[PDB]
Every structure is written in structure tokens, then in C-alpha cells.
Design an enzyme around this catalytic site. Structure first.
Site, PDB file in Angstrom:
ATOM      1  N   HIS A   1       0.991  -1.325  -0.025  1.00  0.00           N
ATOM      2  CA  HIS A   1       0.044  -0.141   0.022  1.00  0.00           C
ATOM      3  C   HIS A   1       0.651   1.322   0.013  1.00  0.00           C
ATOM      4  O   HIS A   1       0.067   2.462  -0.066  1.00  0.00           O
ATOM      5  CB  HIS A   1      -1.020  -0.198   1.226  1.00  0.00           C
ATOM      6  CG  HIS A   1      -2.016  -1.218   1.065  1.00  0.00           C
ATOM      7  ND1 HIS A   1      -2.918  -1.081   0.130  1.00  0.00           N
ATOM      8  CD2 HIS A   1      -2.331  -2.226   1.838  1.00  0.00           C
ATOM      9  CE1 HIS A   1      -3.749  -2.184   0.384  1.00  0.00           C
ATOM     10  NE2 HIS A   1      -3.214  -2.896   1.397  1.00  0.00           N
TER      11      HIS A   1
ATOM     12  N   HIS B   1      -3.695  -3.376   7.624  1.00  0.00           N
ATOM     13  CA  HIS B   1      -4.750  -3.953   6.741  1.00  0.00           C
ATOM     14  C   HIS B   1      -5.180  -2.411   6.370  1.00  0.00           C
ATOM     15  O   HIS B   1      -5.405  -1.541   7.305  1.00  0.00           O
ATOM     16  CB  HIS B   1      -5.604  -4.636   7.575  1.00  0.00           C
ATOM     17  CG  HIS B   1      -7.239  -4.910   6.941  1.00  0.00           C
ATOM     18  ND1 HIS B   1      -8.187  -4.197   7.519  1.00  0.00           N
ATOM     19  CD2 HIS B   1      -7.545  -5.469   5.841  1.00  0.00           C
ATOM     20  CE1 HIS B   1      -9.246  -4.461   6.821  1.00  0.00           C
ATOM     21  NE2 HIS B   1      -9.062  -5.208   5.879  1.00  0.00           N
TER      22      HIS B   1
ATOM     23  N   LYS C   1      -5.924  -9.266  -8.598  1.00  0.00           N
ATOM     24  CA  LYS C   1      -7.296  -9.037  -7.956  1.00  0.00           C
ATOM     25  C   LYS C   1      -7.957  -7.637  -8.530  1.00  0.00           C
ATOM     26  O   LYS C   1      -7.149  -6.837  -9.392  1.00  0.00           O
ATOM     27  CB  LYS C   1      -7.002  -8.931  -6.590  1.00  0.00           C
ATOM     28  CG  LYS C   1      -6.528  -7.794  -5.882  1.00  0.00           C
ATOM     29  CD  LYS C   1      -5.792  -7.766  -4.524  1.00  0.00           C
ATOM     30  CE  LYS C   1      -6.963  -7.847  -3.572  1.00  0.00           C
ATOM     31  NZ  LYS C   1      -7.832  -6.719  -3.430  1.00  0.00           N
ATOM     32  N   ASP C   2      -9.180  -7.313  -8.170  1.00  0.00           N
ATOM     33  CA  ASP C   2      -9.792  -6.138  -8.752  1.00  0.00           C
ATOM     34  C   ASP C   2      -9.263  -4.798  -8.762  1.00  0.00           C
ATOM     35  O   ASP C   2      -9.361  -4.189  -9.444  1.00  0.00           O
ATOM     36  CB  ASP C   2     -11.202  -6.194  -8.290  1.00  0.00           C
ATOM     37  CG  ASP C   2     -11.901  -7.325  -9.316  1.00  0.00           C
ATOM     38  OD1 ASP C   2     -11.549  -8.083  -9.980  1.00  0.00           O
ATOM     39  OD2 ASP C   2     -13.505  -7.441  -9.268  1.00  0.00           O
ATOM     40  N   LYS C   3      -9.000  -4.676  -7.409  1.00  0.00           N
ATOM     41  CA  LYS C   3      -8.377  -3.243  -6.974  1.00  0.00           C
ATOM     42  C   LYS C   3      -7.697  -3.482  -5.791  1.00  0.00           C
ATOM     43  O   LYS C   3      -7.377  -4.010  -4.806  1.00  0.00           O
ATOM     44  CB  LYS C   3      -9.639  -2.692  -6.165  1.00  0.00           C
ATOM     45  CG  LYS C   3      -9.478  -1.111  -5.690  1.00  0.00           C
ATOM     46  CD  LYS C   3     -10.723  -0.538  -5.256  1.00  0.00           C
ATOM     47  CE  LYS C   3     -10.632   1.089  -5.310  1.00  0.00           C
ATOM     48  NZ  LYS C   3     -11.853   1.669  -4.723  1.00  0.00           N
ATOM     49  N   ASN C   4      -6.525  -2.236  -5.959  1.00  0.00           N
ATOM     50  CA  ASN C   4      -5.742  -2.142  -4.943  1.00  0.00           C
ATOM     51  C   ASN C   4      -5.445  -0.407  -4.676  1.00  0.00           C
ATOM     52  O   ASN C   4      -5.026   0.021  -5.570  1.00  0.00           O
ATOM     53  CB  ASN C   4      -4.302  -2.723  -4.743  1.00  0.00           C
ATOM     54  CG  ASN C   4      -3.448  -2.712  -3.309  1.00  0.00           C
ATOM     55  OD1 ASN C   4      -3.808  -3.394  -2.523  1.00  0.00           O
ATOM     56  ND2 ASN C   4      -2.329  -2.065  -3.686  1.00  0.00           N
ATOM     57  N   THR C   5      -5.363  -0.212  -3.458  1.00  0.00           N
ATOM     58  CA  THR C   5      -5.154   1.476  -3.112  1.00  0.00           C
ATOM     59  C   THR C   5      -3.462   1.539  -2.832  1.00  0.00           C
ATOM     60  O   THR C   5      -3.098   0.935  -1.731  1.00  0.00           O
ATOM     61  CB  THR C   5      -6.046   2.059  -2.043  1.00  0.00           C
ATOM     62  OG1 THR C   5      -7.411   1.913  -2.487  1.00  0.00           O
ATOM     63  CG2 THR C   5      -5.770   3.458  -1.997  1.00  0.00           C
TER      64      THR C   5
END
Length: 104
Positions: free
Chosen positions: A10, A97, A31-35
Site C-alpha cells: 500500500h 490492513h 485482484k480487482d482493486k488495490n489502493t
């Protein structure tokens, strides 16, 4: 899961995250999304200052965020840039997290 891994997942030293490369690694499995948070790590760790027992905490200031969002083509992404607060789970005075953008 822990602060060492949170950093890898992150924290970015560029707003122009190479999504199609990084999102394909074993860290993310397409995977679909990560910030990604464009910041040095200390200000990010400091979100959790004095927070020992597991607790979700919203940043006091807005940060530069880069989101890798998957297109209609599996493992191919658009980079979406925003300025926003974000929330993390703090354990033992560190983010472990990523919870969400804008609020907890």
C-alpha cells in the site's frame, strides 16, 4: 496482515504505479482493486501512533492515492488518482490492513 506487508502492498514512491506489472505479482494475484498511498512510510505509520489494541483509524489529513482498478480485460488496469483520507486497522501502533477510502 502486518506492517511489513502493508508497506509492500500500500505505499508507493510514485503516483504512476505500474499496475499491470505489480498487480500481476504474487502479492496481488490480479485482484480487482488495490489502493496505493503516495507517501514516505513514517507519516503513514504515524496514523497509528499510540493505538495498540486492534482498531480502525481514519487519517487526519488527505493523501495522494493511486488505485489500480481492473478493466474488462483480466489483470489489465486503469490507474485512478484521487486525494482523500483513508482508513487502516492499527495494531501495535502500525497499519496492518487497508480498510477503505474516505472513511472507516
Amino acid at each position: 496482515q502486518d506492517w511489513l506487508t502493508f508497506q509492500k502492498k500500500h505505499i508507493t514512491n510514485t503516483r504512476d504505479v505500474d499496475c499491470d506489472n505489480i498487480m500481476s505479482t504474487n502479492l496481488f494475484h490480479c485482484k480487482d482493486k488495490n489502493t496505493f498511498i503516495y507517501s514516505r512510510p513514517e507519516p503513514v505509520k504515524a496514523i497509528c501512533k499510540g493505538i495498540i489494541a486492534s482498531k480502525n483509524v481514519l487519517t487526519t489529513s488527505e493523501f495522494y492515492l493511486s488505485d489500480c482498478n481492473v478493466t474488462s480485460r483480466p489483470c489489465k488496469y486503469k490507474l485512478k488518482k484521487s486525494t482523500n483520507k483513508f482508513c487502516v486497522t492499527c495494531e501495535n501502533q502500525a497499519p496492518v490492513h487497508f480498510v477503505g477510502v474516505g472513511s472507516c
